[PDB]
Scaffold this active site. Structure first.
Site, PDB file in Angstrom:
ATOM      1  N   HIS A 130       0.800  -1.229   0.000  1.00 37.04           N
ATOM      2  CA  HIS A 130       0.000   0.000   0.000  1.00 37.04           C
ATOM      3  C   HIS A 130       0.834   1.282   0.000  1.00 37.04           C
ATOM      4  O   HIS A 130       0.278   2.380  -0.050  1.00 37.04           O
ATOM      5  CB  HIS A 130      -1.081  -0.015   1.088  1.00 37.04           C
TER       6      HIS A 130
ATOM      7  N   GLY B 278       2.732   6.331  10.153  1.00 43.67           N
ATOM      8  CA  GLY B 278       4.109   6.150   9.728  1.00 43.67           C
ATOM      9  C   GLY B 278       4.745   4.864  10.225  1.00 43.67           C
ATOM     10  O   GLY B 278       5.898   4.582   9.915  1.00 43.67           O
TER      11      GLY B 278
ATOM     12  N   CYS C  44       3.634   1.752   9.545  1.00 44.40           N
ATOM     13  CA  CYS C  44       3.478   0.606   8.642  1.00 44.40           C
ATOM     14  C   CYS C  44       4.841   0.101   8.207  1.00 44.40           C
ATOM     15  O   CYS C  44       5.758   0.892   8.013  1.00 44.40           O
ATOM     16  CB  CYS C  44       2.632   0.956   7.426  1.00 44.40           C
TER      17      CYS C  44
HETATM   18  O1  LIG Z   1      -1.930   5.385  12.587  1.00 42.85           O
HETATM   19  C1  LIG Z   1      -2.431   4.530  11.852  1.00 42.85           C
HETATM   20  S1  LIG Z   1      -1.396   3.192  11.301  1.00 42.85           S
HETATM   21  C2  LIG Z   1      -0.604   4.036   9.980  1.00 42.85           C
HETATM   22  N1  LIG Z   1      -1.038   5.150   9.393  1.00 42.85           N
HETATM   23  N2  LIG Z   1      -0.262   5.461   8.477  1.00 42.85           N
HETATM   24  C3  LIG Z   1       0.717   4.562   8.434  1.00 42.85           C
HETATM   25  C4  LIG Z   1       1.873   4.485   7.441  1.00 42.85           C
HETATM   26  F1  LIG Z   1       1.529   3.619   6.460  1.00 42.85           F
HETATM   27  F2  LIG Z   1       2.918   4.015   8.114  1.00 42.85           F
HETATM   28  F3  LIG Z   1       2.217   5.664   6.889  1.00 42.85           F
HETATM   29  N3  LIG Z   1       0.520   3.659   9.396  1.00 42.85           N
HETATM   30  C5  LIG Z   1      -3.900   4.622  11.435  1.00 42.85           C
HETATM   31  C6  LIG Z   1      -4.724   5.644  11.655  1.00 42.85           C
HETATM   32  C7  LIG Z   1      -5.929   5.333  11.143  1.00 42.85           C
HETATM   33  C8  LIG Z   1      -5.863   4.115  10.603  1.00 42.85           C
HETATM   34  C9  LIG Z   1      -6.850   3.305   9.934  1.00 42.85           C
HETATM   35  C10 LIG Z   1      -7.769   2.519   9.566  1.00 42.85           C
HETATM   36  C11 LIG Z   1      -8.775   1.619   9.059  1.00 42.85           C
HETATM   37  C12 LIG Z   1      -9.868   1.260   9.867  1.00 42.85           C
HETATM   38  C13 LIG Z   1     -10.843   0.379   9.382  1.00 42.85           C
HETATM   39  C14 LIG Z   1     -10.730  -0.152   8.092  1.00 42.85           C
HETATM   40  C15 LIG Z   1      -9.639   0.200   7.288  1.00 42.85           C
HETATM   41  C16 LIG Z   1      -8.664   1.087   7.771  1.00 42.85           C
HETATM   42  O2  LIG Z   1      -4.583   3.574  10.807  1.00 42.85           O
END
Ligand SMILES: O=C(Sc1nnc(C(F)(F)F)[nH]1)c1ccc(C#Cc2ccccc2)o1
Ligand SMILES: O=C(Sc1nnc(C(F)(F)F)[nH]1)c1ccc(C#Cc2ccccc2)o1
Lengths: 306, 306
Positions: free
Chosen positions: A41, A143, A145
């Site tokens: 992704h 961030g 992931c």
């Molecule tokens: O903080 C995070 S985890 C994350 N958010 N960004 C990253 C990156 F890919 F590392 F950049 N990792 C976050 C915030 C909100 C979500 C979400 C969600 C979600 C909830 C239900 C169904 C599908 C997706 O994850």
């Protein structure tokens, strides 16, 4: 003495963390030999997430679409492929810090260490259990992931988790290092939610053996129970059913403490039915389920405080 | 989201752990540049411990009395001195893996990561708080002496603890990296015991701010309190008195959540007086005190889930 959620030393994994950028998206990747692993992704922009076609999104990328940074060093992508929910970027350099390793798919109930990373820089380490519902109660921010889960066996790093997403209840989902998700989750923004969870019976029992090994016996009793009678109480309290396999696994701990597994089960049943009476076990006021029988033997003394 | 006791990544410290043997005693040492640090009690045999004179025991040693092993490599001792409760062995090699570092003496209430080590091999990492009574509730077995505690600031390792002993209640005592003990403890086998402990008020408050930042507000109330009125309840429940300095420290967290420190104190007071009503905070059924205000800002989102 003492008993703590202990992680494995993270050094061998720290030396494998890189940063992967595609367009405006940056996350962490895992650099082993001449390959970088990361969540696919990373190729998705600010609208793709909703209904992405990764085959289609990837075919539109070249090797130079991907920017890989190991420290301040820039690695050159010389190939890429998709493996399930992971990208596999081939790079022009082999990681000199690659430890002996394997990729394993962990089972529910099992534990591992997570190295939380941001922009390819490790920031923290903690111990997690794979829940029966295939999620983990991690600690992750935007961030994170591409952060990985692992166990270390002698000199060998068994990688078992890569972080992909957060679910609505704040819990976390991801894949093994072959890119296959744990649980029925997918890497797209949908209505998906963690199914109902259960307490990991086998781990609670291991932990009660750890408490005895460490010198505490207050919760024991003179009763015994049958598997079936235990499991009727288990389902009332939302515990996983105990099986003969789980009883077998508890053999070494049972032998070290001289307490029959089914006698420990009677103890648990009483604790479940009566509560803990303002008392603690290994410093806890609740029954802990994120230590496996392996975790106990690893951390506890080989001789018990009789 | 989520909230876990997170340790610092242990790599920079792993590369500094060695094994030190004197006669029949083996324990861990810390190898920085051309010096190895270790508990002086490595020079004590199977009766010395009771009433050792370290000056006298050490004068009887030569440089070759000490065997230092870094991995499979043998390091040659070319000097030794005593610094308080530590031995300082000079070696013929400089540790190529020495990170940027400092030695700090941590204050009670503050937290750090421990790298549990046996025979100079790191085995686990976990987060600890220095208790008000100058002990830590670690997880240590025979052979763990010389294991170190640390914080990492950017690229710099701040070493703050070296493990020396276990006390009767199973809790742990040791020194800073200048060899001065935390607490009134000594490196000899006496009747010494941990004094009475108290809950770290400032940490409980920080943690309540973390719970709000993570989206939970159930425990708040419409009341406020004065410092003095809070402290009367604090002493009834064996909490450290809150001071204006602690209130000042909670400023940034207070600003991020829009909750006045003294209003959060009223919340705590209510929680202490009324209990938690079968409810949890950040997944805990009890009030946690091993996270500092620093730990919360480090782990939690900079933006709150309003
Ligand atoms: O903080 C995070 S985890 C994350 N958010 N960004 C990253 C990156 F890919 F590392 F950049 N990792 C976050 C915030 C909100 C979500 C979400 C969600 C979600 C909830 C239900 C169904 C599908 C997706 O994850
Ligand atoms: O497991 C440990 S810690 C430890 N035991 N040995 C080592 C070594 F130095 F690393 F070898 N480290 C232990 C067991 C029993 C004790 C003790 C004690 C004690 C209790 C009260 C006063 C003085 C000493 O520590």
């Amino acid at each position: 003495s003492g008993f703590r959620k202990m992680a494995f030393p993270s050094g061998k994994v720290e030396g494998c963390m890189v940063q992967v950028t595609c367009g405006t998206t940056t996350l962490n990747g895992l650099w082993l030999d001449d390959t970088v692993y990361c969540p696919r992704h990373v190729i998705c922009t600010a609208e793709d997430m909703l209904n992405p076609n990764y085959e289609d999104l990837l075919i539109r990328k070249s090797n130079h679409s991907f920017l890989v940074q190991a420290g301040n060093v820039q690695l050159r992508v010389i190939g890429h492929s998709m493996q399930n929910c992971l990208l596999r970027l081939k790079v022009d350099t082999s990681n000199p810090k690659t430890p002996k390793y394997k990729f394993v798919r962990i089972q529910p109930g099992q534990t591992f260490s997570v190295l939380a990373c941001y922009n390819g820089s490790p920031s923290g380490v903690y111990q997690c259990a794979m829940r029966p519902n295939h999620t983990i109660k991690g600690s992750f921010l935007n961030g994170s992931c591409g952060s990985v889960g692992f166990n270390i066996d002698y000199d060998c790093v068994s990688f078992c988790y890569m972080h992909h997403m957060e679910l609505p209840t704040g819990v976390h989902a991801g894949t093994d290092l072959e890119g296959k998700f744990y649980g029925p989750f997918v890497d797209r923004q949908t209505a998906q939610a963690a199914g109902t969870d259960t307490t990991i019976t086998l781990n609670v029992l291991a932990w009660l053996y750890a408490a005895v090994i460490n010198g505490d016996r207050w919760f024991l009793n003179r009763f015994t129970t049958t598997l079936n009678d235990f499991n009727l109480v288990a389902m009332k309290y939302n515990y996983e059913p105990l099986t003969q396999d789980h009883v077998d696994i508890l053999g070494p701990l049972s032998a070290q403490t001289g307490i029959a597994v089914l006698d420990m089960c009677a103890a648990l049943k009483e604790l479940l039915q009566n509560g803990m009476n303002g008392r603690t076990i290994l410093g806890s006021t609740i029954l802990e389920d994120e230590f496996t029988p392996f975790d106990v033997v690893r951390q506890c003394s080989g001789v018990t405080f009789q």
